[PDB]
Symmetry: C3
Subunit: 337 residues, 3 copies
């Protein structure tokens, strides 16, 4: 019987179905790259209020939101417009992510479409039962006050409809490469975004030297709250030891992590990668967190790495350690006795 | 014109469209029986969080709920899981009962899928405009405290989204057959459930010796509140007189009925059944209720009955006469002056 | 690519998509006329609780609402029934107006289907993002108190889910034609309704001597609040001057308009119509409103007019100038110092 056969097949499902949704200009640009470079077992959805930007984007599925409100002509940097446009097209957004076990929402906060629509996409995602994760950036300071204030209000709004919320503050990118021009600024930020999003997705979906169980992934991210990342990599031969230390000292991981529970670790490298190096990585990280933190990790081989091991660290539950101001994220300053 | 022809046809509709929805293990088992034995003009919908149980079930329509939450692997006796799973699949549940004039929701309360999903199915049913009736059982006491507390909380939740709520307390079954083994326990309870559900459905949908008008059915059940049943039957020749007295004295009808408004009576028997016997039944019952109670009744002939008349009594509006405790239903004890 | 081609085509869209929805007897009758006489670029949707009335109606789309509640047998003058019936069929109502840039909701308030369902249709319309305008009538006084009280409560309910709400009080029709019989009463009211609805639609959708931009239409009506109309026309040769004065003195425009912002003006006439006459019309009206009022206007040629110019005035934002009583609309009486 068709129904019964359908029920049996479901039980044989082997991999988690993942969907990546990019909103606004920056988000569509991230999506275009993932589609071209490829992103192991994950469909791509692009959404915009701006028709031209959507046309030049490459993705499995495109949705023009706010057709009646904006008219395919952008949201002009206004968050409230991006939000009403998304609410207006909620039905189409929902049908595009309906069968997903997990949904990644990515965009650069600061403008009108991404900042306004991301929280709406996340709310629809949770309503349908998918693990809902966001990977977004805060704007550079040179972009100015209005852009940051809008980004911060959007981060707040997004926190409420998200399982784990991963924030990358673009301004820290200058601490990685001090004298960089705005030209290459958004090029570096692009790189970081792809590594974070692709690193998390592959950790969950790419066959490695140890199996990572989606049910564990879900248990840790279900209450990931606010999260931050760290990226490091070594070319030497004492690789692991150096990549992890670099990742842990990354300016991107701008928060006190000793009180963290949960964390996801993805160690990448060449054919000669060993569970031994991965383990050294995990334990070095494992000691800086809470003694009872849950850690999810994996290890994958990447041809293009040639002779390097890259380490991606996502540390969760740090919201209590951060302060959300109109001007950005500031490491919290706890009150004396 | 296709539209106009469609509108005319609707006016020619003759019978109420009924749907029976069974949730969880016990509910699916009840559905499997109804489908095989047949149930005059009513489609069958089975829903479960457990794939295996759904596979071995027989029904017109099957829905695996909570696919992302539980993974076709049951709800493990947790009501909150059954509830989120149902909310997660609300769209599919709705489309399955969308065109129903009336919806019957049946399950055994106590576990996780039925207790949690029944109130959700009932809420969707009312939202679409269907007469919403539930026929459920409370667990035996030997099953223990946790199972009863969960059943009671579910009954409460279900009361709020239901037109009339029919409760069968399995523990009373021992007063019918005193020394019975757990083996046959759930076999007796199965029998009772089928007679209640099939008795109500046929009363509404089976051609009898008097026509029962769906609009009257709807008027009485629209405010049936909490309801209880009674079953009796006579083999003698003073049949009617005995079946009704047995039904009225049934341990299943564990409440003071003198203050009841509304009631549904279904008298069943062989080819020799007469409107005379039905009427004696009705009047004997009619005198124990409120002097202004509304009674809906019918009379049908059943080949398999050979030489017996069976009487099904459903007495509504008794909630004020019952006390809902964590440990079960207790006849209420009104406060003195 | 199909998606991309689809996105490009959207950018080439030239006209606003308009839908007219008539509810109840009077509304269906208005719809039947619009469909036959034709109504430049606007689809017609008819909805009723009464099957017979829906059958004899002519429209692009018909929807029988409340199929489970009422059974194609009307709502018997009860607003609460009309409302539950509409809520019950919300999904079908929504799909019928889903792709509309603008939605006009018309009916005669006073009975059960129109009064109850109009606010529901308007709420669905706003939810999807369409400009939501209502054009409705208040009953004659000879119809009695109950009919007016129900009409007034419906107007109140409708105000909350509408962008601009246009009210035509049928009782004023006697000031236009003093000694008129009930026979011709509803015939005159029919005429007025068609001119108001068709006048507004054509102003937005009919090619004229000056282009009216939908975006301006939307900006003015977005906050039109309560609106009233005025109709005038001249056969002479000092046409414009007379039509506008007649329109401005119309008993239909029963409110103090000096404090009005926004207004829509549609001047119609024969082949010899000139932007000069239209302009005289606009300026004569423009001086009675607030010095900063926004006015939207157009001018169209109608063959059937032969030698007359007709003027349609819709003046918005007058709610503060009106008093909503159980017995009707009364020009407000501001409180002294
Ligand atoms: N990594 C990148 N970040 C970018 C890029 N362009 C902008 N951004 C970041 O995102 C912010 C603005 O993003 P978008 O241009 O995508 C704004 P959006 O399209 O969502 O709003 P509207 O233009 O109003 O439609 C800006 O403040 C930057 O911090 C880019 O090419 N790469
Ligand atoms: N009449 C019957 N009642 C049953 C039967 N099995 C269980 N029950 C009653 O229902 C209660 C448990 O029912 P189910 O096994 O259907 C619980 P459910 O499937 O809804 O929850 P999960 O296992 O967590 O998925 C139990 O407390 C009993 O009182 C049966 O075969 N027949
Ligand atoms: N312009 C017209 N107005 C009408 C006409 N018939 C009624 N009406 C007005 O509308 C009011 C009643 O309208 P309907 O007959 O359409 C009431 P409806 O169908 O919505 O309610 P139910 O009969 O309960 O289904 C009445 O109080 C009148 O003021 C008509 O032919 N033309
Ligand atoms: Mg943009
Ligand atoms: Mg089970
Ligand atoms: Mg009618």
């Amino acid at each position: 019987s068709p129904e019964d056969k359908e029920l049996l097949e479901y039980l044989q499902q082997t991999k988690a179905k993942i969907t990546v949704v990019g909103c606004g200009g920056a988000g569509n640009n991230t999506i275009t790259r993932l589609k071209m470079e490829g992103i192991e077992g994950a469909k791509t959805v692009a959404i915009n209020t701006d028709a031209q930007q959507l046309i030049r984007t490459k993705a499995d599925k495109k949705i023009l939101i706010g057709k009646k409100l904006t008219r395919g002509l952008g949201a002009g940097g206004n968050p409230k417009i991006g939000e009403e446009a998304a609410k207006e097209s909620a039905e189409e957004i929902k049908a595009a992510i309906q069968d997903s076990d997990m949904v990644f929402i990515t965009c650069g906060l600061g403008g009108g479409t991404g900042t306004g629509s991301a929280p709406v996409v996340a709310e629809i995602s949770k309503k349908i039962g998918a693990l809902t994760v966001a990977v977004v950036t805060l704007p550079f300071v040179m972009e100015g006050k209005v852009r940051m204030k809008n980004a911060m209000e959007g981060l707040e709004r997004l926190k409420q409809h998200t399982d784990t919320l991963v924030v990358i503050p673009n301004e820290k990118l200058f601490e990685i490469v001090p004298n960089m021009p705005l030209k290459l600024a958004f090029k570096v930020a692009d790189e970081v975004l792809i590594n974070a999003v692709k690193g998390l997705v592959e950790l969950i979906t790419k066959d490695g030297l140890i199996n990572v169980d989606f049910a564990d992934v879900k248990a840790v991210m279900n209450n990931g709250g606010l999260a931050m990342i760290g990226i490091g990599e070594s070319d030497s031969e004492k690789r692991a030891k150096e990549a992890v230390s670099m990742a842990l000292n990354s300016p991107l991981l701008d928060v006190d992590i000793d009180g963290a529970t949960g964390a996801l670790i993805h160690v990448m490298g060449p054919e000669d990668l060993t569970l031994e190096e991965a383990r050294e990585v995990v334990a070095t990280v494992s000691s800086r967190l809470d003694p009872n933190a849950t850690i999810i990790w994996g290890a994958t081989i990447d041809e293009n790495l040639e002779n390097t091991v890259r380490v991606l660290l996502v540390i969760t539950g740090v919201q209590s350690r951060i302060e959300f101001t109109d001007t950005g994220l500031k490491r919290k300053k706890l009150e004396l006795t």
